[PDB]
Design a binder for this molecule. Sequence first.
Ligand SMILES: *SCc1cc(Cl)c2cc(C(=N)N)sc2c1
Ligand SMILES: *SCc1cc(Cl)c2cc(C(=N)N)sc2c1
Ligand SMILES: [Mg+2]
Ligand SMILES: [Mg+2]
Lengths: 12, 12, 228, 228
Amino acid sequence: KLMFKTEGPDSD
Amino acid sequence: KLMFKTEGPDSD
Amino acid sequence: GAMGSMERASLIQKAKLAEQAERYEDMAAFMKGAVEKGEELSCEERNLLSVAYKNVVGGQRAAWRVLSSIEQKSNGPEVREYREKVETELQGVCDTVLGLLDSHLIKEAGDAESRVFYLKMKGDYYRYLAEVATGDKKRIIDSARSAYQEAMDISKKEMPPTNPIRLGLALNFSVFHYEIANSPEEAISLAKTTFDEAMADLHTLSEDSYKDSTLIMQLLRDNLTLWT
Amino acid sequence: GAMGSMERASLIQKAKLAEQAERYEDMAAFMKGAVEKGEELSCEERNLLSVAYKNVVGGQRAAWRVLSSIEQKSNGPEVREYREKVETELQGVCDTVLGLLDSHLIKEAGDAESRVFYLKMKGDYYRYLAEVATGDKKRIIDSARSAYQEAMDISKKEMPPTNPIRLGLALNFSVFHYEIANSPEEAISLAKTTFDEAMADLHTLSEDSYKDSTLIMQLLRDNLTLWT
Ligand SMILES: *SCc1cc(Cl)c2cc(C(=N)N)sc2c1
Ligand SMILES: *SCc1cc(Cl)c2cc(C(=N)N)sc2c1
Ligand SMILES: [Mg+2]
Ligand SMILES: [Mg+2]
């Protein structure tokens, strides 16, 4: 899935 | 530490 | 719990060691133990709590998406069973974080920096629950929206537009609008207004604060690029 | 154990799903459950067992090294306590793998491909125990050497020099010599002889087998480059 930018660690 | 090449997944 | 016998300072020290070792499940357990000491958290400690759980839930979300995609394509019981196993574990982590915020981090948070930080986390963990919800989905979405909205109201009244916490909140709330609430226009409007108001306030910042704010502004820009 | 009620085929299917989801602790637990069914493992199943535990122990080894380095530099009790916690968990995983090999994978393994595969794993997990040993260190080193030596003897008699399992065994035994046994000359000699004997046998292989063998030969070359 195309994940959009969210705050903090890009852990997924 | 300098880790040398071992077989399989380089998981460390 | 299991951290009840360890000193609060030793739990914080061990959370920092666990972060260095990339041991995020341990880091989260140490921070849960520190929260359960009952004292309020400093800015650094709040960030250790959030980094720990974000890394743990991040791994679970990435695994859940891989399994859900295999399940969707397949449509024996194994793929569904295993997707359910990961989903339950993810729900458990969200419930644990929400429990810490409700018992009693939010109610004791009076300063804007702490209250907005916790209400944003409440919004984020209800958003992660919404990503897997199919049943209660509407109520979970409402709970995420309510937490984000309270955090936004406080942030607009009490923090400057370049405030890193305010920026991160707006970034996350815009993503909630885009893909949870099916409100892409609200998402785009929020990301644009937040970016523009921050740009106009950059002149007030030091070199270090400018770096902090522009890093998050670039994330708003990245999303806007994908959405427009 | 906890996997006792699940079908062997469902445990293998779920181990493959866990690998796709990068859920290596689950993958290892599913493969442990499959081994405990008591039936021998196929080539694919042996590789699923080894990939699962290698990923789990790999994370623990990387964390242990970060903590040990902080501890060494520092020389309160917290760094030692946390390094000990990770060390105990790592020892537990090695003991679990060694227990599966001893109960009863090795004793039931008659073919060279399975017997060498298991004896190499026995050598590897005693080597991971040796990396953290300071007490029993000599006996752990002896156990690793003995397993590797039995695997080498069988491999030289029963497999061609380009055999991927034989190559991986030689690669790992040469690393055991270099940094566990403090025998760098034995390490270099073994890596050189193994590389040269494999090179001379490449002409017998198909395109796919050639790719498999040369990939491991490059690892022997990488080590030789660092050692000479
Ligand atoms: S309150 C100052 C501060 C800000 C951030 Cl973003 C931060 C992250 C930390 C971490 N260890 N991951 S600590 C810390 C402190
Ligand atoms: S026995 C044929 C075979 C060889 C290798 Cl290296 C292998 C790895 C697998 C994995 N899923 N990681 S399965 C498999 C089979
Ligand atoms: Mg207060
Ligand atoms: Mg047999």
